[PDB]
Amino acid sequence: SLALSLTADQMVSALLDAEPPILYSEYDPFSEASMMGLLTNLADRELVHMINWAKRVPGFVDLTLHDQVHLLECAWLEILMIGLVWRSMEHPGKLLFAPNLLLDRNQGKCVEGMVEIFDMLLATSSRFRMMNLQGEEFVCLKSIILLNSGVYTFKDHIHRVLDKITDTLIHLMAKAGLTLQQQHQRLAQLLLILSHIRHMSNKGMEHLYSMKCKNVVPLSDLLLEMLDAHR
Amino acid sequence: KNSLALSLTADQMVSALLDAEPPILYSEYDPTRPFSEASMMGLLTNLADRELVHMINWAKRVPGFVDLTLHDQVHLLECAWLEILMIGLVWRSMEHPGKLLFAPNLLLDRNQGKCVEGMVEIFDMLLATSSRFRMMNLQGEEFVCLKSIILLNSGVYTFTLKSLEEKDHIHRVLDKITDTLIHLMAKAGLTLQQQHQRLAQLLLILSHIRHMSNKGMEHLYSMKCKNVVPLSDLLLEMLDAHR
Amino acid sequence: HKILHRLLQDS
Amino acid sequence: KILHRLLQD
Ligand SMILES: O=S1C=CC(c2ccc(O)cc2Cl)=C1c1ccc(O)cc1Cl
Numbered sequence A: 001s002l003a004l005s006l007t008a009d010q011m012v013s014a015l016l017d018a019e020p021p022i023l024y025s026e027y028d029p030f031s032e033a034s035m036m037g038l039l040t041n042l043a044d045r046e047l048v049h050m051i052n053w054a055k056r057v058p059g060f061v062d063l064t065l066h067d068q069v070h071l072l073e074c075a076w077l078e079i080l081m082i083g084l085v086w087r088s089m090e091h092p093g094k095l096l097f098a099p100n101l102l103l104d105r106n107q108g109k110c111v112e113g114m115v116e117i118f119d120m121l122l123a124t125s126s127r128f129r130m131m132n133l134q135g136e137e138f139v140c141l142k143s144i145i146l147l148n149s150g151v152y153t154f155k156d157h158i159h160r161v162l163d164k165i166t167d168t169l170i171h172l173m174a175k176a177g178l179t180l181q182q183q184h185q186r187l188a189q190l191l192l193i194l195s196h197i198r199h200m201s202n203k204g205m206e207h208l209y210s211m212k213c214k215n216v217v218p219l220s221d222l223l224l225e226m227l228d229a230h231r
Numbered sequence B: 001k002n003s004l005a006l007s008l009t010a011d012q013m014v015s016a017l018l019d020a021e022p023p024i025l026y027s028e029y030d031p032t033r034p035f036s037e038a039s040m041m042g043l044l045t046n047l048a049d050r051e052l053v054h055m056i057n058w059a060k061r062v063p064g065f066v067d068l069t070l071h072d073q074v075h076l077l078e079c080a081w082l083e084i085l086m087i088g089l090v091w092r093s094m095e096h097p098g099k100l101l102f103a104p105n106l107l108l109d110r111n112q113g114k115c116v117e118g119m120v121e122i123f124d125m126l127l128a129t130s131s132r133f134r135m136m137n138l139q140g141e142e143f144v145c146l147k148s149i150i151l152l153n154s155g156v157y158t159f160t161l162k163s164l165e166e167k168d169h170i171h172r173v174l175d176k177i178t179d180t181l182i183h184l185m186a187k188a189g190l191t192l193q194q195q196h197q198r199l200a201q202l203l204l205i206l207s208h209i210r211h212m213s214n215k216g217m218e219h220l221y222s223m224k225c226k227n228v229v230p231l232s233d234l235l236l237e238m239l240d241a242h243r
Numbered sequence C: 001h002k003i004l005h006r007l008l009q010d011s
Numbered sequence D: 001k002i003l004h005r006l007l008q009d
């Protein structure tokens, strides 16, 4: 496994190079079916890029195909949400789903139960904003989610890669001039947010399941496959 | 003002948390009668309800928790109560591979968890967490830190403008517990790289503990509507705080 | 009238 | 299983 042989800088640049692009929503208020359709189409197209982003995560390709499927099936909504939260940092009070799709919590009331998920996402973006989260830190957190969120539903290799990313996070903070006490404090603060990102995913997974049997908007086959893996 | 928690040293933090530990309760389990879905759920409901009473009074003794307003204390316990019940159960079950020690007289395996619909999937996650604690050789001083971190963290992001100092006070105590965890790992002869890695490994488990709590909350809501076994008035309050 | 309130309340 | 196919490529 070549992931463990990389340096901290070579881990950062590999994750930065593997970043998926920022996709656009379908061009042109919103109802329930219209907003859910725009979000469904966007999430479905983002999933294709995430799967290719996962292959470029150092150490992910070393896993068997079954383990790659298990990790993506459990973390896919977390990865979509943390990317949405990252894009929305420069837009306080708003969620940047796409450069042409910027929504506030009032627009989240068009869909049932969507305003609760919106407020949790907005709160996470404010937390990233108050902590001055850096893009190098963000790509490490997103890789941690991919490898960690499903590791206990199965493994020594995945934990070795997780320790590798932990070394990379600390290496970034020491590069920024933080003291040893500030390094493990910021490391703890960042990882505790992943507990809430997991919470938003479980709440978001239940909402997508309700949208399925409400049948407001038809879901894609890939989205249904990722959704059915949680029930 | 003049918080007692911010003044505590690392060793004093451990002592206060260890002194606040709730007891390990027993259940009304009779090994004579075999298991039924209503009986086993009644045992787990009766046990969890009595543990909730001890948890609420344990939370009062967590450094910094008493400084929060009553509205914040209610909110933190309402969202973290099942997480705290689960990490305690996982901690009790470390020395019993493949078994969950709900009580010293109630030791269940993944087979007996099948006596309840959907409960088997939650049993396997709790077992995997207990295996992870055994794999890491989790220490009781580290465990009491993680349990207090769950209480303060799990509901801090679910909080208008002036109460930002209350959210800031919680983050100050959270950093205080982080210093305590690092102080523990430094005493056990771990290098700085080992301290950061083990610190990350412990906090990533809290992500899976949140996942078990969310799945457990949906399973408890299912039993409520199934009406097969009645839930206590306190559990119904804590359960309705998530919908 | 929450039970959690009173259990947190009484001293 | 679309997730399988997208990972093979
Ligand atoms: O319920 S959801 C909360 C956030 C989103 C979301 C949508 C698009 C996207 O590119 C990223 C995200 Cl995180 C929700 C959603 C909605 C419909 C749907 O079909 C799928 C999803 Cl994921």
Ligand SMILES: O=S1C=CC(c2ccc(O)cc2Cl)=C1c1ccc(O)cc1Cl
Residues within 6 Å of the ligand: B041, B044, B045, B046, B047, B048, B051, B082, B085, B086, B089, B102, B119, B122, B216, B219, B220, B231, B235
């Ligand atoms: O669904 S559950 C999975 C674990 C448990 C559990 C039970 C007792 C206890 O002291 C601690 C735990 Cl974590 C379940 C449970 C069951 C019924 C019930 O009424 C409440 C709970 Cl919490």
